[PDB]
Enzyme design. Structure first.
Site, PDB file in Angstrom:
ATOM      1  N   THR A 195       4.937 -10.885  -0.853  1.00 12.02           N
ATOM      2  CA  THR A 195       6.193 -10.737  -1.315  1.00 12.02           C
ATOM      3  C   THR A 195       7.151 -10.144   0.059  1.00 12.02           C
ATOM      4  OG1 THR A 195       5.685  -9.708  -3.585  1.00 12.02           O
ATOM      5  CG2 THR A 195       7.806  -9.639  -3.154  1.00 12.02           C
ATOM      6  N   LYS A 253      -1.870   0.069  -0.055  1.00 13.95           N
ATOM      7  CA  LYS A 253      -2.738  -0.101  -0.169  1.00 13.95           C
ATOM      8  C   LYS A 253      -3.898  -0.848   0.984  1.00 13.95           C
ATOM      9  CE  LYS A 253      -2.300   0.023  -5.120  1.00 13.95           C
ATOM     10  NZ  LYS A 253      -2.558  -1.400  -6.278  1.00 13.95           N
ATOM     11  N   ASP A 259       8.377  -0.067  -2.102  1.00  8.62           N
ATOM     12  CA  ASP A 259       7.341   1.026  -2.872  1.00  8.62           C
ATOM     13  C   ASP A 259       6.070   0.960  -2.361  1.00  8.62           C
ATOM     14  OD1 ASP A 259       7.044  -1.331  -4.215  1.00  8.62           O
ATOM     15  OD2 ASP A 259       7.245  -0.387  -6.357  1.00  8.62           O
ATOM     16  N   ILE A 260       5.529  -0.173  -2.449  1.00  8.29           N
ATOM     17  CA  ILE A 260       4.041  -0.532  -2.191  1.00  8.29           C
ATOM     18  C   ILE A 260       3.839  -1.759  -1.319  1.00  8.29           C
ATOM     19  CG2 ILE A 260       1.754  -0.979  -3.342  1.00  8.29           C
ATOM     20  CD1 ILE A 260       3.031   0.047  -5.902  1.00  8.29           C
ATOM     21  N   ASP A 268       6.433   1.249 -11.234  1.00 10.75           N
ATOM     22  CA  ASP A 268       6.470   1.146 -12.572  1.00 10.75           C
ATOM     23  C   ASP A 268       5.154   1.157 -13.412  1.00 10.75           C
ATOM     24  OD1 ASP A 268       6.173  -1.712 -11.968  1.00 10.75           O
ATOM     25  OD2 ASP A 268       6.886  -2.173 -13.846  1.00 10.75           O
ATOM     26  N   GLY A 279       0.683  -8.088   0.190  1.00 12.39           N
ATOM     27  CA  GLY A 279       1.756  -8.418   1.272  1.00 12.39           C
ATOM     28  C   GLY A 279       2.464  -9.543   1.375  1.00 12.39           C
ATOM     29  N   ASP A 295       0.824  -4.257  -1.021  1.00 14.35           N
ATOM     30  CA  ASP A 295      -0.445  -4.667  -1.542  1.00 14.35           C
ATOM     31  C   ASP A 295      -1.542  -5.784  -1.078  1.00 14.35           C
ATOM     32  OD1 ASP A 295      -2.806  -4.828  -3.236  1.00 14.35           O
ATOM     33  OD2 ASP A 295      -1.437  -5.094  -5.222  1.00 14.35           O
TER      34      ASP A 295
HETATM   35  N1  LIG Z   1       3.346  -0.118 -10.296  1.00 13.08           N
HETATM   36  C1  LIG Z   1       2.481  -0.736  -9.296  1.00 13.08           C
HETATM   37  N2  LIG Z   1       2.976  -1.935  -8.797  1.00 13.08           N
HETATM   38  C2  LIG Z   1       2.073  -2.483  -7.958  1.00 13.08           C
HETATM   39  C3  LIG Z   1       0.639  -1.853  -7.632  1.00 13.08           C
HETATM   40  N3  LIG Z   1       0.169  -2.593  -6.746  1.00 13.08           N
HETATM   41  C4  LIG Z   1       1.024  -3.857  -6.620  1.00 13.08           C
HETATM   42  N4  LIG Z   1       2.076  -3.754  -7.187  1.00 13.08           N
HETATM   43  C5  LIG Z   1       3.285  -4.414  -6.951  1.00 13.08           C
HETATM   44  O1  LIG Z   1       3.239  -5.597  -6.258  1.00 13.08           O
HETATM   45  C6  LIG Z   1       4.178  -5.541  -5.235  1.00 13.08           C
HETATM   46  C7  LIG Z   1       3.685  -5.914  -3.797  1.00 13.08           C
HETATM   47  O2  LIG Z   1       2.927  -7.044  -3.832  1.00 13.08           O
HETATM   48  P1  LIG Z   1       2.245  -7.882  -2.513  1.00 13.08           P
HETATM   49  O3  LIG Z   1       3.060  -9.027  -2.663  1.00 13.08           O
HETATM   50  O4  LIG Z   1       2.158  -6.792  -1.493  1.00 13.08           O
HETATM   51  O5  LIG Z   1       0.968  -8.523  -3.245  1.00 13.08           O
HETATM   52  C8  LIG Z   1       4.797  -4.122  -5.241  1.00 13.08           C
HETATM   53  O6  LIG Z   1       6.201  -3.900  -4.681  1.00 13.08           O
HETATM   54  C9  LIG Z   1       4.407  -3.678  -6.783  1.00 13.08           C
HETATM   55  O7  LIG Z   1       5.546  -3.997  -7.631  1.00 13.08           O
HETATM   56  C10 LIG Z   1       0.394  -0.588  -8.732  1.00 13.08           C
HETATM   57  O8  LIG Z   1      -0.776  -0.041  -8.262  1.00 13.08           O
HETATM   58  N5  LIG Z   1       1.110  -0.220  -9.278  1.00 13.08           N
END
Ligand SMILES: Nc1nc2c(ncn2[C@@H]2O[C@H](COP(=O)(O)O)[C@@H](O)[C@H]2O)c(=O)[nH]1
Ligand SMILES: Nc1nc2c(ncn2[C@@H]2O[C@H](COP(=O)(O)O)[C@@H](O)[C@H]2O)c(=O)[nH]1
Lengths: 187, 186
Positions: free
Chosen positions: A114, A138, A107-108, A168, A112, A110
């Site tokens: 995960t 993002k 989905d996203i 979510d 990075g 953020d």
């Molecule tokens: N629902 C939602 N989830 C987010 C948002 N920003 C980050 N996440 C969660 O963080 C995950 C990615 O985290 P990372 O490991 O890139 O920091 C995404 O798969 C998601 O579940 C947001 O604005 N809304």
């Protein structure tokens, strides 16, 4: 007294629409073309990153016109985890991935972390090639150990608290028909 | 030697379109309306039966206009397993489901043993209520052990070997834009 479903309706009522479902479909179409050009001859295994990857992947799949397989993976990361070790694995990659081209769909993007950890683990299984597809990016929000940029990006966004189309709000609202920003009263 | 990809391309070329993508959209529309009327207030956990339910569910989800949650489950069954007695679980139902209205979503109801086993294990986790949704129902093909009727059905079909829209042909063709029948010669 007051229920969680009651708060959710309220959160949705107060939310601001950032992208209409039609715009998401358009982004999904743009990505499909890019994915096609790169992966059509690679016979890839497309990995759904649970659970955020579910509706994006579902809608994306029928826009893909070349031989492919589907599988899924599930991993969770703790708030203060910046290394990538200390991420809880729910569903691991399989050895079947060895010597295969893999596309990872989430989905996203953020921080990075995960997705980097997931990609490393898929590679550790012997995957020939690994690509990444993300509905939203993002772009201003990476950290050093995060996956810096994704191969395929549906939409570029600022750091909002967003939901809908698989994303979510505390497990709810993945079913909202578009991408919405949470009101500051609800963040 | 002949690649698996080449064979797949060929299997798709000889395939017969049973339903178009547009037809499948309309089926999903029907299901959404019926699901709304049944569950709009139940605050359900919608559960994806992997991996068949993924594309049907993904397309379905944004059609549903009410508060809900998402989870997934993964159970496989031997064809010779005529009871659910030897189904092998990949992903089990959670305790969180206790006291919850649950909707199970799948690609296809065939014999029904796999689905009925999943519902039973969900019930055993202390679930309050379990409803079942399926994109396609092979209505003629039910066994006495399996789940007899699904609460929500997208499309009813004859006993064709089918693929597309989440339904595979040996792991492939889940991306086919509609429902297709394998050529008899395949
Ligand atoms: N629902 C939602 N989830 C987010 C948002 N920003 C980050 N996440 C969660 O963080 C995950 C990615 O985290 P990372 O490991 O890139 O920091 C995404 O798969 C998601 O579940 C947001 O604005 N809304
Ligand atoms: N791809 C595909 N899968 C099928 C077909 N018939 C049955 N299945 C698989 O078997 C499951 C139904 O098993 P049952 O409930 O009959 O034990 C479905 O979820 C589906 O994954 C078919 O025509 N095509």
């Amino acid at each position: 007294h007051m229920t969680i479903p009651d708060k959710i309706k309220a959160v949705y009522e107060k939310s601001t629409c950032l992208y209409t479902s039609n715009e998401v479909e358009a982004a999904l179409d743009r990505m499909a073309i890019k994915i096609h050009e790169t992966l059509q001859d690679k016979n890839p295994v497309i990995i759904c990153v649970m659970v955020g990857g579910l509706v994006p992947l579902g809608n994306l799949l029928h826009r893909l016109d070349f031989p492919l397989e589907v599988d899924y993976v599930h991993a969770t990361r703790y708030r203060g985890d910046l290394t990538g070790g200390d991420i809880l694995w729910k569903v691991r990659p399989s050895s079947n991935l060895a010597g295969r081209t893999v596309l990872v769909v989430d989905d996203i993007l953020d921080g990075g972390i995960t997705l980097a950890a997931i990609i490393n683990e898929i590679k550790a299984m012997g995957a020939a090639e690994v690509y990444s597809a993300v509905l939203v990016d993002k772009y201003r929000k990476r950290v050093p150990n995060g996956l810096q940029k994704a191969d395929f990006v549906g939409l570029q966004v600022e750091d909002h608290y967003i939901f809908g189309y698989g994303m979510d709000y505390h497990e709810y609202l993945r079913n909202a028909p578009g991408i919405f920003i949470v009101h500051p009263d609800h963040e």
